[PDB]
Design a protein around this ligand. Structure first.
Ligand code: HEM
Length: 421
């Protein structure tokens, strides 16, 4: 028998809330980066790592984490992800001194480990909890919540922490943010204990009901995922797109100031528009995918619009019109962020009935690997040859992704399971 539980929204809302808190702490150091350099007496690279350590810890630690999800369950993944997020939030509090910088790195590394229990999870929570006609919407909401934390992270820290020269008052203002983040993370950890269940009493869809029957080596599951030609192409293409987004969002601030000097206030607005429009695209992508069930056609269409959005952004940023950059960043952020739930759900189509944590996780490793490569590479071309070769470097690599995306077969295995009747 198949039934849909009413508490599915609470689980996603709670998951989106404490993924919002975890994603907030990724960017809270970079939002007031100019302040933390003065407080801790460190260079901008040190602070920029505090945000880049999220990507470099995901690459090696995902496979052990994905193994924990299969063996222990989703609730243990949620508790550990919430507890480490809460533990990392509290460790940051004990670091409110100019000479006590390493405690933040220890606190940030603990949070960065908690990301491994977060970023690959949204497709897993959506599958276990939500039905066939709302499975892709739930994944978008989790990405909506994760992107909301970034969106909140741009404007909340700068008003909680004024750029005051006095150190003792600056520590007090920074302390208030840490208490609030520690307060909400502990509050959300409390909710995860009582809200997050291991699984609903009834399977939501025929895909999950059949998955529980046709679900032993963990490395065998890894091997069969890479035996899939379609999934391997999707792993590369998703990394080419999501990795470009990480390089685009990180280097967006320095690219605008290169052409529009003295617009740091607007550069943050532009960097907020790419996220403000980002979650609107993510939610729309979830509803559109579930209404039409065209996962392959949307993947190519969104990927091309990502490419066209990057081409128009590259060749119109030079013209000197500020509102044009607002539209191009918003439009590209609309599609690139909308590709994240589309990529997660299309991977489940190609890799059914393999574990959604492994399938969507392997997309994330490619996103981190290409995001790290692009951020280091595009930063080098911008410094040496200019900003336009750096943006074209993403246009050329996104062009390859579109070509490889067209080679992905429309092998929707989960859809076949639903329609078996
Ligand atoms: C009066 C007796 C009520 C009962 C016995 C009841 C029952 C439930 C149950 C069983 C759940 C899911 C939790 C779970 O399955 O473990 C739930 C959640 C919920 N209930 Fe009720 N309900 C009642 C009244 C109401 C009313 C009047 C509202 C008015 C808005 C409401 C709004 C909600 C909402 C919004 C959720 C989902 C929580 C979320 O989405 O965050 N309930 N309720």
């Amino acid at each position: 028998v198949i039934k849909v539980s009413r508490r599915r929204w609470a689980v996603v809302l709670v998951f989106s809330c404490y993924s919002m808190c975890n994603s907030f702490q990724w960017i809270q150091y970079g939002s007031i980066n100019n302040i933390f350099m003065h407080f801790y007496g460190v260079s901008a690279f040190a602070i920029d790592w505090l945000s880049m350590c999220y990507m470099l810890t995901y690459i090696p630690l995902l496979l052990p984490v994905a193994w924990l999800l299969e063996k222990f369950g989703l609730r243990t993944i949620a508790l550990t992800g919430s507890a480490l997020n809460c533990l990392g939030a509290w460790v940051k509090l004990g670091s409110l001194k100019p000479h006590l910088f390493p405690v933040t790195v220890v606190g940030q590394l603990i949070c960065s480990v908690a990301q491994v229990f977060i970023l690959g999870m949204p497709s897993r929570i959506a599958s276990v909890w939500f039905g066939a006609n709302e499975v892709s919407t739930a994944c978008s909401v989790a990405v909506f919540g994760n992107q909301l934390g970034i969106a909140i992270g741009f404007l909340v820290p700068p008003v909680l922490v004024p750029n005051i020269e006095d150190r003792d008052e600056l520590a007090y203002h920074i302390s208030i943010m840490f208490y609030i983040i520690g307060g909400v993370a502990t509050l959300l950890l409390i909710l995860v204990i009582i809200v997050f269940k291991e699984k609903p009493k009834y399977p939501p869809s025929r895909a999950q009901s059949l998955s529980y029957a046709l679900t032993a080596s963990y490395l065998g599951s890894i091997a069969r995922l890479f035996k899939n030609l379609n999934f391997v192409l999707l792993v590369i293409t998703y990394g080419l797109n999501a990795g470009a987004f990480y390089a685009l969002s990180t280097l967006l601030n320095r690219m605008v100031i290169w052409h529009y000097p003295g617009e740091e206030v607007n550069a943050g607005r532009i960097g907020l528009t790419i996220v403000i429009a980002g979650m609107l695209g993510a939610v729309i992508s979830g509803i559109w995918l579930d209404r039409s069930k065209t996962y392959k056609e949307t993947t190519l269409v969104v990927y091309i619009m990502t490419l066209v959005g990057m081409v128009v952004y590259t060749f119109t940023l030079n013209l000197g019109h500020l509102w044009v950059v607002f539209i191009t960043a918003g439009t590209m952020g609309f599609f690139m962020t909308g590709y994240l739930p589309l990529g997660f759900e299309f991977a489940v189509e190609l890799t059914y009935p393999e574990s959604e944590g492994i399938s969507s996780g392997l997309l994330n490793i490619s996103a981190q690997v290409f995001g790290i490569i692009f951020t280091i590479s595009q930063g080098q071309i911008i410094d040496n040859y200019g900003t336009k070769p750096g943006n074209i470097f993403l246009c050329v690599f996104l062009t390859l992704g579109a070509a490889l995306t067209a080679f992905i077969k429309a092998d929707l295995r989960r859809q076949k399971a639903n329609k078996e009747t």
